[PDB]
Amino acid sequence: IRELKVCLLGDTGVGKSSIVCRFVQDHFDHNISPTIGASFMTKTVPCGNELHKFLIWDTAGQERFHSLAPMYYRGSAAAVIVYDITKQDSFYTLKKWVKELKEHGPENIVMAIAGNKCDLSDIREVPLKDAKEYAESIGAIVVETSAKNAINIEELFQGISRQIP
Ligand SMILES: Nc1nc2c(ncn2[C@@H]2O[C@H](COP(=O)(O)OP(=O)(O)NP(=O)(O)O)[C@@H](O)[C@H]2O)c(=O)[nH]1
Ligand SMILES: [Mg+2]
């Protein structure tokens, strides 16, 4: 068993809790309420010839909670930074989280970007190519996901697993 601390960063409403909830519980609630404080969940996944037990810290995205964020991301093997493909604002917040992360988190932290709500493509505001370049220009992976339709949730975490010895 290889314990991996992962933290979720992103603006409110982007789907951080929905992603974890899909990953861990294989469940989606359209009426999932916001997170107050933080939420911890865990899932063990076989990767190569070793087990990866993800210790997932799903942080509350709301403004009043930013002041509590360094507590969860410090000591993290990886950080999942989530935007909402349907709101471009959520994509600039992603950049502000990346910055804080390169300044206050582990020197060697795995960066993964999730372009959540990809099922709402008919209202897309963030092209995949723009997110792919940004990810490449920061040594991060990018996957467009949908917690709703279970698209690339498992793959998002296979992305983290792949970038570790
Ligand atoms: N269509 C669609 N809706 C989604 C998807 N993921 C999340 N949502 C919806 O988006 C809303 C916010 O989801 P949530 O997971 O709470 O986001 P959050 O970033 O965790 N919220 P908070 O930051 O306040 O804790 C909810 O209504 C949720 O059902 C998705 O892939 N597709
Ligand atoms: Mg939440």
UniProtKB/Swiss-Prot annotation:
For this chain the motif Switch 1 maps to 27-39
What is its cofactor? Mg(2+)
Q: Which stretch carries the motif Switch 2?
A: 60-76
Q: Which GO terms describe its cellular component?
A: cytosol; early endosome; early endosome membrane; early phagosome membrane; endomembrane system; Golgi apparatus; intracellular membrane-bounded organelle; late endosome
Print the keywords alphabetically.
Cytoplasmic vesicle, Endosome, Golgi apparatus, GTP-binding, Hydrolase, Lipoprotein, Membrane, Nucleotide-binding, Phosphoprotein, Prenylation
Activity regulation remarks: Regulated by guanine nucleotide exchange factors (GEFs) including RIN3 and GAPVD1 which promote the exchange of bound GDP for free GTP. Regulated by GTPase activating proteins (GAPs) which increase the GTP hydrolysis activity. Inhibited by GDP dissociation inhibitors (GDIs) which prevent Rab-GDP dissociation.
Name one process (GO BP) from the record.
positive regulation of phagocytosis, engulfment
Q: What is its main location?
A: Golgi
Q: Which GO terms describe its molecular function?
A: GDP binding; GTP binding; GTPase activity
Annotated positions binding GTP = G13, G15, K16, S17, S18, D29, H30, T35, G61, N116, D119, A147, K148
Membrane topology designation: Lipid-anchor
Give the EC number(s) under which this enzyme is classified.
Answer: 3.6.5.2
Compartment list? Golgi apparatus, trans-Golgi network; Golgi apparatus, trans-Golgi network membrane; Early endosome; Cytoplasmic vesicle, Phagosome
How would you summarize where this protein is expressed among tissues? Answer: Highest expression in placenta and brain with lower levels in heart and lung. Not detected in liver, skeletal muscle, kidney or pancreas.
The subunit field of the Swiss-Prot or TrEMBL record says: Interacts with OCRL. Interacts with NGFR. Interacts (in GDP-bound form) with RIN3 and GAPVD1, which function as guanine exchange factors (GEF). Interacts (in GTP-bound form) with EEA1. Interacts with EGFR. Interacts (in GTP-bound form) with APPL2; interaction contributes to or enhances recruitment of APPL2 to the phagosomes; interaction enhances Fc-gamma receptor-mediated phagocytosis through PI3K/Akt signaling in macrophages.
Entry note about domains: Switch 1, switch 2 and the interswitch regions are characteristic of Rab GTPases and mediate the interactions with Rab downstream effectors. The switch regions undergo conformational changes upon nucleotide binding which drive interaction with specific sets of effector proteins, with most effectors only binding to GTP-bound Rab.
Task performed by this protein: The small GTPases Rab are key regulators of intracellular membrane trafficking, from the formation of transport vesicles to their fusion with membranes. Rabs cycle between an inactive GDP-bound form and an active GTP-bound form that is able to recruit to membranes different set of downstream effectors directly responsible for vesicle formation, movement, tethering and fusion. Required for the integrity and for normal function of the Golgi apparatus and the trans-Golgi network. Plays a role in insulin-stimulated translocation of GLUT4 to the cell membrane.
Could you identify this protein by its name? Ras-related protein Rab-31
Gene (name only): RAB31
